[PDB]
């Protein structure tokens, strides 16, 4: 019907980004891909099958929340959340268009669970603002909210999302013991020091980072401890290799065949080693590690004959105290909600969204990353030469994007 | 360590059936053939070598799928799938034993790929129930699963298995042109009518069968259109004559050496023709035709189509066809013939899809056959006429 608004847009989905044309009527949102687009043609159909929205229609009545989102460090994207708990994300040309879209959409605000007013102002508000005006921190302390729910709140507000592997949500490793036969959730030694970054846990390697920070000499390259992030598409694809369409996506992006078993996520205990040994590995976990068994198993069908030489990915090997996936996730989420984590989580938050994210305290905390990572870092619009901008966007996706800082004061303990 | 359950059973291998004892402990499944058995001692050594399970051990921790199976039409077998994609099949004395074996193995159900619950009940569930309760059809319609994958799915819950060639998986011929210099996957004529059996493809030969049906006259064996089956242990061996056990077994089958060059798989084009004019060849294809290049060499070879240079090519083009949009919009029809409502009954009659009655589930109860020699005699009859996959649905299969 009445097309109240129309604008070029970009569908931001788990494994697909496609240029299309958003159109907003008086009751729905429509999106059609540019099936003629060169880049879009080279997209595997299998992948397109898992991608919703390419020709979607969203009922205004179904809208429940509208979040301001940044695509590749640029505050020009939006993410709408549907009543059926699903969500869609489009990236527009300018923050200016976003505003038009936000004002031409229902006044769902940012939802209602966070305790923020249902106003278009909120949808556009900033991360630090949203945090400030929310009651979640209290409820979290008051135990009305679980550690998992709280960490999801922070990540959502910080702009993290399941629709962009470059800004996936971020969760901390909670346990350090993945060797033992049993796991005693009351024995401190089994828990990770939630006050230190991954790169600071092992003093042996920690030295390499402090040393490298000290003996720094360069131009336009502020000193940094890690050239590797704790959250990136690459990382995310590795953790979700056993799930479509990530699997296929990776494969297509890998000459059609998997990667050497010793490099692909194969062992939960082995990953933790690498995250303590490797100088380039400072990875942090993902939400799933606390609720999605699938992620740890080969869900392929049967009688599909492949083990001839054809590389194949089998079940992730769990720690002895974890018989089957359902077990690992159960126990892990239990540890995440344990009392130990509860009384330290604020410190980890400080490193990720807190006052130790960037600055004097960030350097004293051994928590400094490549400057091109932090918010504000770059302005793709400034780059005028396409081949130049692209190369830049390519780098952002390679280094990763630090979550938006939510507070510049020490986060309150639970 | 301690044996929780022990019972007589038969290993059902790619081309071997050996009696032995199956011991279920508390953490593993064991199987030791009875080497003192006569039949066993008669089996060729080369064949035994390429046969695994005669002295096997399987870890519970490795179990992933436990499907109920049928052997020679009798619902008394079982097939276990391992985490490394391996599988082993056993045949027991009766369903009651199968049930015990199931309640003694890990609760893995039928796996977690077809959307079914991981409950021992599924492992005993009926083929029709598995179909109904699965979620593979929708995923298929959604294109999240390929035609190959869906077909393989249907076969698996239908009871088909790479472990018993008499019930080998069933895949349809997709292309009909194997002699043109090039194959346009956009020219309808280059394809096969999936709503029709292989026998009803040739207009002329078709009428022949219809006549045979109407003008039956016997009343000692209900009417049937074909006396050949689309899937047989022999056809399978034939397609895979250049690889063994198969090769070696075949040589033992033909009592000595190979088969007559003219009546042997030597060219896909020729074989296809044979399956169009020859009144006794309504063969259908097998998975291999869509992924196993090695199948078309010798280590003379199979004469590949013009558009098919090397073996690797025939497989890719053919696989592309199986996945082409032409196949997609009409593939459901084929399913209606093989596992659908047109598999049997009046509907199968119009379809020109009726096979020997001794080929359908429920056709015969080997247990009632008291005379030992008559039983063995009956079984061989079954291995010759082929076994029709179980019926999955009785309604029309929705299109993709």
């Amino acid at each position: 019907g009445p097309v109240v608004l129309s604008t070029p847009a970009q569908l931001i989905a788990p494994v697909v980004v496609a240029k299309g044309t958003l159109s907003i009527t008086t009751t729905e949102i429509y999106f059609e891909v540019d099936e003629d687009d060169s880049a879009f043609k080279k997209i595997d159909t299998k992948v397109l099958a898992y991608t919703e929205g390419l020709h979607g229609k969203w009922m205004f009545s179904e809208i429940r929340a509208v979040f301001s989102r940044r695509y590749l460090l640029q505050n020009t994207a939006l993410e709408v959340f549907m009543a059926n708990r699903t969500s869609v994300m489009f990236n527009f040309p300018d923050q200016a268009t976003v505003k038009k879209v936000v004002y031409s959409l229902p006044r769902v605000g940012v939802g209602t669970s966070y305790g923020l007013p249902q106003a278009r102002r909120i949808s556009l508000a900033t991360p630090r603002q949203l945090y400030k005006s929310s009651n979640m921190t209290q409820r979290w302390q008051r135990r009305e909210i679980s550690n998992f729910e709280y960490l999801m709140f922070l990540n959502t507000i910080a702009g993290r999302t399941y629709n962009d592997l470059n800004q996936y949500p971020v969760f901390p490793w909670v346990l350090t013991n993945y060797e033992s036969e049993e796991l005693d959730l009351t024995l401190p030694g089994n828990f990770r020091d939630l006050s230190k970054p991954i790169g600071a846990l092992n003093p042996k390697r920690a030295v390499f980072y402090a040393e490298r920070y000290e003996t720094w000499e360069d131009d336009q390259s502020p000193p940094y401890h890690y050239n590797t992030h704790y959250s990136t598409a690459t990382s995310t694809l590795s953790w979700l290799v056993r799930i479509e369409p990530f699997t296929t996506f990776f494969l297509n992006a890998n000459d059609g065949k998997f990667d050497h078993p010793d490099r692909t996520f194969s062992s939960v205990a082995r990953s933790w080693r690498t995250s303590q040994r490797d100088t380039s590995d400072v990875k942090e976990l993902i939400p799933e590690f606390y609720y999605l068994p699938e992620m740890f198993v080969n869900s392929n069908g049967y009688n599909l004959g492949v083990r001839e030489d054809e590389v194949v990915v089998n079940d992730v090997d769990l720690p002895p105290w974890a018989k089957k996936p359902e077990d690992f996730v159960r126990i892990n989420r239990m540890a995440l909600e344990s009392e130990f984590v509860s009384c330290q989580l604020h410190q980890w938050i400080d490193l990720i969204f807190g006052y130790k994210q960037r600055g004097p305290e960030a350097v004293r905390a051994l928590n400094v990353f490549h400057y091109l990572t932090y918010e504000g870092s770059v302005n793709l619009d400034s780059i005028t030469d396409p081949v130049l901008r692209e190369a830049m966007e390519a780098q952002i996706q390679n280094f990763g994007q630090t979550p938006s800082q939510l507070l510049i004061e020490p986060h309150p303990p639970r």
Side-chain angles (χ1 to χ4, degrees), chain A:
Chain A
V3 192
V4 183
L5 189 164
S6 152
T7 170
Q10 223 177 183
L11 176 59
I12 300 296
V15 287
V16 177
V17 176
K19 308 172 179 179
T21 299
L22 196 81
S23 49
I24 306 168
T25 181
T26 318
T27 45
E28 313 118 302
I29 308 178
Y30 298 70
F31 183 73
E32 302 297 310
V33 198
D34 186 293
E35 299 154 64
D36 307 306
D37 180 358
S38 70
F40 180 76
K41 294 172 181 175
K42 320 168 194 182
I43 300 175
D44 182 339
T45 298
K46 192 184 175 71
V47 181
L48 290 187
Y50 283 81
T51 309
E52 344 76 291
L54 297 176
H55 293 292
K57 166 177 173 180
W58 323 72
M59 237 66 111
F60 268 34
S61 49
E62 244 53 57
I63 309 294
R64 282 290 172 303
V66 172
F67 283 82
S68 281
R69 287 290 177 274
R70 312 108 85 290
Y71 181 60
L72 294 168
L73 299 174
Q74 315 299 91
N75 184 15
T76 50
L78 203 62
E79 169 173 50
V80 194
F81 291 82
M82 311 305 268
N84 63 48
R85 295 296 191 174
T86 196
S87 80
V88 62
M89 183 179 136
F90 307 93
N91 174 46
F92 311 85
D94 39 272
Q95 219 290 301
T97 309
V98 171
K99 191 173 183 170
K100 296 174 188 166
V101 170
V102 182
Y103 274 81
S104 71
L105 250 38
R107 202 183 72 167
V108 299
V110 88
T112 36
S113 46
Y114 298 162
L116 296 171
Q118 285 195 280
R120 309 210 202 303
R121 176 184 70 267
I122 296 290
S123 288
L124 293 161
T126 67
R128 289 216 286 164
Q129 282 183 294
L130 293 173
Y131 175 68
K132 180 71 189 176
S133 300
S134 177
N135 53 230
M136 295 297 258
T137 313
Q138 339 314 299
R139 315 220 269 112
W140 170 61
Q141 292 178 292
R142 221 180 300 136
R143 312 285 162 133
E144 296 165 37
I145 290 303
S146 62
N147 292 327
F148 183 99
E149 309 183 74
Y150 191 51
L151 291 174
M152 273 298 266
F153 161 64
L154 297 174
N155 277 287
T156 293
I157 296 315
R160 306 257 95 182
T161 166
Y162 285 108
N163 293 307
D164 188 340
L165 298 192
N166 295 296
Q167 300 175 83
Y168 221 61
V170 180
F171 270 67
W173 285 86
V174 164
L175 294 174
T176 61
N177 174 26
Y178 305 92
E179 316 269 53
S180 174
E181 268 279 308
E182 288 186 295
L183 185 69
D184 182 35
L185 300 191
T186 71
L187 208 184
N190 292 324
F191 295 78
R192 160 274 188 79
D193 185 335
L194 271 172
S195 72
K196 306 184 184 179
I198 289 308
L201 293 184
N202 178 51
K204 306 286 186 172
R205 176 180 70 185
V207 178
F208 177 46
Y209 299 116
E211 180 189 3
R212 200 257 285 300
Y213 198 73
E214 256 61 298
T215 59
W216 190 275
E217 32 191 42
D218 209 306
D219 189 16
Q220 312 140 190
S221 304
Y224 69 60
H225 295 87
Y226 327 92
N227 54 315
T228 285
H229 212 290
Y230 50 75
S231 168
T232 61
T234 278
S235 289
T236 299
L237 277 167
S238 320
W239 298 133
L240 309 176
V241 72
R242 266 158 279 260
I243 296 171
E244 293 294 0
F246 306 104
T247 310
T248 301
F249 179 86
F250 172 60
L251 250 28
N252 296 318
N254 218 53
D255 289 58
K257 238 58 223 60
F258 286 120
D259 193 2
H260 191 14
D262 306 312
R263 314 216 302 89
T264 22
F265 174 44
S266 54
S267 176
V268 47
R270 176 166 188 284
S271 293
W272 173 255
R273 292 196 193 70
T274 304
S275 51
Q276 298 295 295
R277 303 277 284 182
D278 233 78
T279 173
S280 324
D281 193 292
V282 293
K283 291 180 194 186
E284 206 58 315
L285 260 12
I286 254 63
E288 292 79 304
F289 270 80
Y290 296 91
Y291 76 84
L292 188 88
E294 295 90 300
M295 190 200 110
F296 301 73
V297 315
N298 174 320
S299 287
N300 271 299
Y302 296 104
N303 299 131
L304 298 166
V306 182
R307 184 207 167 298
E308 54 199 68
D309 52 276
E310 216 66 59
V311 294
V312 62
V313 183
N314 286 302
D315 296 343
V316 171
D317 50 354
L318 323 179
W321 48 263
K323 300 307 179 173
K324 287 291 179 53
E326 292 69 27
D327 291 327
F328 181 67
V329 172
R330 186 176 77 264
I331 302 169
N332 205 33
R333 169 52 178 297
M334 264 177 79
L336 169 62
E337 302 295 347
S338 80
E339 207 56 50
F340 291 109
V341 176
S342 290
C343 60
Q344 292 277 272
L345 200 64
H346 56 299
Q347 309 200 72
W348 182 76
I349 297 173
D350 287 313
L351 292 169
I352 321 293
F353 319 82
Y355 76 89
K356 302 188 174 180
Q357 184 198 84
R358 37 151 49 160
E361 233 70 64
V363 45
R364 199 231 286 184
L366 218 294
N367 194 55
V368 181
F369 303 74
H370 195 305
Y371 84 95
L372 198 98
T373 285
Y374 304 74
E375 50 181 325
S377 175
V378 318
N379 188 87
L380 294 175
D381 260 8
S382 295
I383 309 297
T384 313
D385 178 4
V387 69
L388 290 181
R389 177 199 250 267
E390 192 289 334
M392 176 52 81
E393 300 179 309
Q395 197 175 60
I396 307 177
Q397 293 185 61
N398 222 283
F399 294 359
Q401 315 178 207
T402 286
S404 295
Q405 181 167 57
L406 303 177
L407 64 170
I408 51 180
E409 300 287 41
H411 187 293
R414 203 180 195 196

